[PDB]
Amino acid sequence: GPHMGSDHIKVTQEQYELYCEMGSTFQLCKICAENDKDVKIEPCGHLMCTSCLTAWQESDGQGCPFCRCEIKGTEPIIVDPF
Ligand SMILES: [Zn+2]
Ligand SMILES: [Zn+2]
């Protein structure tokens, strides 16, 4: 309900560095690796591409497909690199 507008997240060197060993980008969805996340899962804390999420929820819909657990907090946020 709340969090009308899109939130803003800040990336940390740790993350980039972590994903650096992989050769990818955080903001970049690790689902289709085509578009950014532009979303966030809470209270868990898993990011992903909504447009992709729907695909998951279109096949199941069992909360966050990352922790296969229901979601409480969700909204269109804007991922920003460091
Ligand atoms: Zn995507
Ligand atoms: Zn999750």
Side-chain angles (χ1 to χ4, degrees):
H3 321 122
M4 272 78 171
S6 175
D7 270 15
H8 279 311
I9 280 151
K10 180 68 162 204
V11 166
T12 42
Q13 279 192 244
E14 57 205 336
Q15 303 152 359
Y16 209 42
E17 270 209 38
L18 290 148
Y19 275 60
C20 269
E21 292 187 18
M22 326 301 167
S24 195
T25 38
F26 174 85
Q27 51 269 278
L28 201 211
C29 75
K30 306 320 183 320
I31 280 198
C32 69
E34 192 58 72
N35 324 339
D36 282 304
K37 304 149 149 189
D38 288 23
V39 90
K40 176 170 171 85
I41 304 289
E42 264 210 53
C44 177
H46 286 156
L47 326 311
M48 65 191 62
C49 49
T50 298
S51 207
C52 329
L53 167 285
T54 304
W56 147 258
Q57 291 247 319
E58 277 269 85
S59 208
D60 165 358
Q62 163 147 101
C64 202
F66 277 55
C67 36
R68 292 288 291 286
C69 176
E70 205 61 87
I71 328 174
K72 324 182 151 186
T74 53
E75 68 150 311
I77 74 76
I78 284 303
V79 203
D80 275 21
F82 164 91

